[PDB]
């Protein structure tokens, strides 16, 4: 019994997978659903640090499951949870700036950026671990 499928990274009771290909934000959501997972929704500061380190180290621009599609300037996670005030620190300086209408959040450098949802980027899926 192992807590995560092969190639998935265990962290604090959940399993994470960073793609080796790029898709747009909606196709990224689908990709995660297809493996019984979810375009990553971040619930803790420790989790955000963990994900940002890997995005920074890999130098990969990476979708997270966060958007202000439904109402501009109101960011919501894909599980419906609202973006809490304790998460505003992570936006890069000058972001979110919605330049050219940017409605999907990404790991970019040391923090978060809003970018065009049609852009192809890597993505991270999250599902819970088995117990063993
Ligand atoms: N992972 C992306 C790394 C590059 O980040 C820059 O370009 C992104 C793509 O556009 C923007 O979404 C970012 O906000 C950022 N940017 C552009 C701009 C800008 C301001 C005025 C005119 C043109 C661009 N101001 N700040
Ligand atoms: Ca919009
Ligand atoms: Ca926006
Ligand atoms: Ca931006």
From Swiss-Prot:
Changing residue 97 to D: Loss of binding to ICAM3 and HIV-1 gp120. In vitro, is a receptor for HIV-1 and transmits HIV-1 either in trans without DC infection, or in cis following a DC infection to permissive T-cells to induce a robust infection. Bound HIV-1 remains infectious over a prolonged period of time and it is proposed that bound HIV-1 is not degraded but protected in non-lysosomal acidic organelles within the DCs close to the cell membrane thus contributing to the HIV-1 infectious potential during transport by DCs from the periphery to lymphoid organs. Changing residue 98 to A: Loss of binding to ICAM3 and HIV-1 gp120. Disulfide bonds join 4-15, 32-125, 104-117. Keywords: Adaptive immunity, Calcium, Cell adhesion, Cell membrane, Disulfide bond, Endocytosis, Glycoprotein, Host cell receptor for virus entry, Host-virus interaction, Immunity, Innate immunity, Lectin, Mannose-binding, Membrane, Metal-binding, Receptor, Repeat, Secreted, Signal-anchor, Transmembrane, Transmembrane helix. This is CD209 antigen. Ca(2+) binds at residues 95, 97, 99, 102, 113-114.
């Amino acid at each position: 019994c192992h807590p995560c499928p092969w190639e998935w990274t265990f962290f604090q009771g959940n399993c994470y997978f960073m793609s080796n290909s790029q898709r747009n934000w909606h196709d990224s959501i689908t990709a995660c659903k297809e493996v019984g997972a979810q375009l990553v929704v971040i619930k803790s500061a420790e989790e955000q640090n963990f994900l940002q380190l890997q995005s920074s180290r890999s130098n990969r621009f990476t979708w997270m499951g966060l958007s202000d599609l439904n109402q501009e300037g109101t960011w919501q996670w894909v599980d419906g949870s609202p973006l809490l005030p304790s998460f505003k620190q992570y936006w890069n300086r000058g972001e979110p700036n919605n330049v050219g209408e940017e409605d999907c959040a990404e790991f970019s450098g040391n923090g978060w950026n809003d970018d065009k949802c049609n852009l192809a980027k890597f993505w991270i899926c999250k599902k819970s671990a088995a117990s063993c």
